[PDB]
Structure formats: C-alpha cells, structure tokens
Structure 1
Amino acid sequence: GYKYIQELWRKKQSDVMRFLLRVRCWQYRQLSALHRAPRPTRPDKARRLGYKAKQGYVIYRIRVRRGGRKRPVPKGATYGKPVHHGVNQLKFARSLQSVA
C-alpha cells in the first residue's frame, strides 16, 4: 500500500528519516513526560501491533530517561559481601519500553 512507510521507517540512518526523527524528538522533548497523542505517529507500526482506527483506541506518548539503574542506597555503603558492592554499573531487568 503501508509497505512503503514500512521500508521507509527502516532507513533511519538516511537523510529524510534523520531529519524527521530529529524534529519529532525535539518536539516531543518539549511536551510533558506523559501526554495523550491525537493519532498514532506510526500508523503502520500501530496496525502491526494491533491498532484498529476506531473509537476506544487511545495512543499515549511517553518519555523515559535512558541509562541503567543506580542502586538506591545511602552514600555508598551497600552493607554486604564484596559481591554486592555494585551500585553504578547495574542494569535493570525490564526494558525501558516495559517501563513506558
């Protein structure tokens, strides 16, 4: 049709898609952290993931801060055996998409 927008959204390193992904990311970075979108930004990826364009279906856009999960402990001091002295380089077990 959708198969053109699909193969287009795979050249994210191109010129047009690196301009669009950048003006989109700039505009998204100015709105709230969790706000309702009027319509699906990617209508194809939305159909593929189950979005029928009918009443009741809602699209929320949401932003999440990148990076790992620093351990929530006082200054350093995770009292335990040296195995669990790790705070900085830890990673979270759920993807940022699952947190969105």
Structure 2
Amino acid sequence: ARSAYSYIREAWKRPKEGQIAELMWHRMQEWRNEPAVVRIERPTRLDRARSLGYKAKQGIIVVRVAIRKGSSRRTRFNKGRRSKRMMVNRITRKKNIQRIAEERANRKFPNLRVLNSYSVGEDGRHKWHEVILIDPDHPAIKSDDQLSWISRTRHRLRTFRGLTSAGRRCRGLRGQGKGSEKVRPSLRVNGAKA
C-alpha cells in the first residue's frame, strides 16, 4: 500500500495548493526572520531527505539555507571593454542557487560534509533549500555501510569541488551521450566549454 511518505511527496508536487500552501504561507514568515543558515531538528520533506540519504541517526544534520533570487550581483566594468563584455544586468552566474545554498551551509559546519539537498520553496526574493550534512568523524556513521563512504579522505569538501548532487547536474554530467562532449570527465579538462 501507499507509504505514508508518498503523501509528503504528493503534497510537494504542488506547493501552492491545499494544506501545504497554507503551511508555507505560515512558515516563511518565521523563516524570513531566521538567519542565512539554520540547523533544524527534522527535515521539512521527510520523503525527500530519506530518498536522498537521510537517516534519523547520530551525525546526520539538516539545515535550511536562504539565498537571494535572481541573476548575478555584478559590478560594472572600470576599464576598457568591448561591447560584448560591458554587460551587467543580464549576466547570470554559472552556479545554480541550490549549489550556493549547499556551499553556504557547508561553510557553517566546517567539520561536516554535504550529502545532498532539496528545495523547500521560495517567496518573492528568497529561495530556501534544506541541506543534509554528515559528520565523517562520528562512529555510527563510520560504521554505517551506507554512509561510511563519505568518511573517506577523498571526500573532504565535496561541495566545493562539485562532487555533490546538484554539483554534478550543474556541471552538465547528467547525459552519458550526445551533449556531454565538453562536460565529462570534467569541465576544466575540456578547456571550460560547457
């Protein structure tokens, strides 16, 4: 039969409908008064978290991060530029907001490593994402056959090197075929053309 979880998911398909619509209208009010990065005891979208790797276990942390909406906050040029580069308003960053959120959260918890993250809505100018982080030094995690992999030294600062969920998608590594010529194995190895 349907898992209870399936209901949380179903609700979040249309976040501006039904009960969840009212919850959001409620919550954001408190969120907007909260800080850039706030650790929360429980994931707002349990199905999502668990689906991403979350477990109610020691060493598993979740945190909501607020990021401003819109294009790049860019300074206009202060020297000679050909028209093509005199741009300011339409320039957008190559990193998506969810990735920024993941990095901000990770910096708040220097000892933790990002596991994954998901969106929890947005108002007119914020965008909120909840980041799941893990304590690579806490046994319980070191002893978990499903998360211990993140304890490896090779995983130090995953987010900052784009080894994250959104990291890899933002890097155009989704497709294994046509279109990923300048993407895989890495952008830099491909002269930065994707």
Q: TM-score, normalised by structure 2?
A: 0.47
Equivalent residues of 2:9, 2:45 under 8 A apart: no
Paired position in structure 2 for 1:24: 27
Stretches of structure 2 lacking an aligned partner (at least 5 in a row): 102-194
2:42 is the alignment partner of 1:9: no
Identity of aligned residues (%): 34
Aligned partner letter, 2:31: Y
Q: What is the count of residue pairs matched by the alignment? A: 98
Say if 2:39 and 2:63, in contact at 8 Å, map to a contact too: yes
Say if 1:69 and 1:91, in contact at 8 Å, map to a contact too. Answer: yes
Is 2:97 the counterpart of 1:92? no
Kindly provide the CA deviation profile for residues 11-69 of structure 1, in whole angstroms up to 9, marking residues without a partner as x. 22313121112112111111111121122111111001110111110011110111110
Q: Which residue of 1 aligns with 2:62?
A: 59
Distance 1:58 1:23 in 2: 24
**Residue aligning to 1:33:** 36
How far 1:77 moved relative to its partner? 4.1
The structure richer in strand per residue is 2
Name the SS for the 2:63 alignment partner. strand
Taking a change above 3 Å as real, the CA distance of residues 30 and 64 of structure 1, as seen in their structure-2 partners, is: same
Q: Which is bigger in relative contact order (C-alpha 8 A, separation at least 6)? A: 1
Three-state SS of the structure 2 residue aligned to 1:54 is: coil
8 Å CA contact retained: 1:78, 1:84: no
Cα distance in 2 for partners of 1:78, 1:17 equals 50
Q: Following the alignment from structure 1 to structure 2, what is the Cα–Cα distance between the partners of residues 46 and 37?
A: 13
> What's the counterpart of residue 70 of structure 1?
73
| Letter of the 1:16 counterpart | Q
Q: Detail structure 1 runs of 4+ shifted over 3 Å in the superposition.
A: none
Amino acid at match of 2:20: M
What is the TM-score when the length of structure 1 is the normalising length? 0.87
